[PDB]
Amino acid sequence: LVHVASVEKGRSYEDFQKVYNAIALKLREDDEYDNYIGYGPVLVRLAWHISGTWDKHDNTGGSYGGTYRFKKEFNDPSNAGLQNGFKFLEPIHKEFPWISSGDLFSLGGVTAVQEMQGPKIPWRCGRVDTPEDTTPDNGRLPDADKDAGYVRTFFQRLNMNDREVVALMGAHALGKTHLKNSGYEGPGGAANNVFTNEFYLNLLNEDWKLEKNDANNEQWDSKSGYMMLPTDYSLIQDPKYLSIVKEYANDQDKFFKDFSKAFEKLLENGITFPKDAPSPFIFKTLEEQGL
Numbered sequence: 616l617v618h619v620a621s622v623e624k625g626r627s628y629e630d631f632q633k634v635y636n637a638i639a640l641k642l643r644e645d646d647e648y649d650n651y652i653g654y655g656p657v658l659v660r661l662a663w664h665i666s667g668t669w670d671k672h673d674n675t676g677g678s679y680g681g682t683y684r685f686k687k688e689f690n691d692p693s694n695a696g697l698q699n700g701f702k703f704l705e706p707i708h709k710e711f712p713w714i715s716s717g718d719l720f721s722l723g724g725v726t727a728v729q730e731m732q733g734p735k736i737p738w739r740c741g742r743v744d745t746p747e748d749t750t751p752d753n754g755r756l757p758d759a760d761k762d763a764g765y766v767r768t769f770f771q772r773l774n775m776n777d778r779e780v781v782a783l784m785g786a787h788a789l790g791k792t793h794l795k796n797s798g799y800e801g802p803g804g805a806a807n808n809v810f811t812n813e814f815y816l817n818l819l820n821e822d823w824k825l826e827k828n829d830a831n832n833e834q835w836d837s838k839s840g841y842m843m844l845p846t847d848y849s850l851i852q853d854p855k856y857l858s859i860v861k862e863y864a865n866d867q868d869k870f871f872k873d874f875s876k877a878f879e880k881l882l883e884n885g886i887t888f889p890k891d892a893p894s895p896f897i898f899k900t901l902e903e904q905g906l
């Protein structure tokens with residue numbers, strides 16, 4: 616199974632910048648969502664979950680086909696809550712019907728990171744919608760109740776190595792866990808709609824207490840009112856992961872650089888880009904455009 620990127624016919628950088636801008640303007644407008652967090656975090660999570668179904672062994676799943684639009688995937692228990700992100704993107708898709716679903720969902724994540732003052736994330740177009748029978752079965756996204764060995768093995772299916780895993784997990788500074796979605800509750804830190812290295816600082820510097828929450832699941836809770844999943848906490852239990860956590864806690868610029876690379880890789884897994892495809896796009900923020 617090969618998925619070759621195919622640019623939406625007649626479209627170029629400036630067209631995709633317009634889609635970026637529409638997402639970014641709506642992010643600005645819809646500032647009350649989830650008790651004033653806004654939609655940035657859920658859009659990042661959506662971009663990751665539509666990509667994280669990939670299996671490197673047979674090229675099933677991945678962002679290419681836009682299959683989250685089909686009920687089997689939309690209704691995956693692992694995706695509970697992401698319907699909010701999908702609904703946010705609906706008016707964007709109506710305004711720009713020419714964009715593919717996978718391009719829209721992945722671009723939502725890029726837009727969110729940049730508009731939350733994160734690093735620039737280069738982004739490539741050309742994902743092509745595939746039919747309902749190409750939708751991956753549920754169960755390919757990761758469990759949260761597990762240890763470092765589970766995390767390492769899981770992410771190897773996505774061709775991610777230790778540095779990429781630790782960098783990607785820094786997105787857990789964003790947003791919050793919701794008991795009704797996942798059986799976990801609380802934020803990872805204070806600045807949960809601005810992209811920073813706070814996840815790593817909090818892992819290292821907070822006083823964490825293992826507790827069983829109201830859904831009967833174990834999570835690590837700090838005196839400051841933050842939480843970590845068991846899979847998050849595993850990053851300071853495993854010696855190799857811990858070394859990288861320290862690096863990113865000490866150097867936000869390095870975290871930004873590594874996150875940008877890993878997130879682009881995640882969003883592009885499974886896609887073959889022809890050697891004459893456009894170079895990756897770097898979208899201007901609204902601020903950079905005076906909008």
Ligand code: HEM
Pocket residue numbers: 656657659660663695696757758759760766783784786787789790791792793794796797798799844846878
């Ligand atoms: C071992 C891997 C991971 C596990 C087990 C995991 C698990 C979870 C869980 C249980 C939630 C809470 C969902 C809810 O209750 O609404 C969550 C939220 C989130 N996840 Fe992860 N995650 C993983 C990796 C990632 C990665 C790689 C990214 C992106 C780079 C990511 C981005 C996010 C974001 C931004 C949220 C907040 C969403 C919101 O506020 O609505 N996660 N994750």
Ligand SMILES: Cc1ccnc(N)c1
Pocket residue numbers: 787788789790791792801802803842843844847
């Ligand atoms: C919001 C969030 C998600 C996952 N892990 C955390 N520590 C925080």
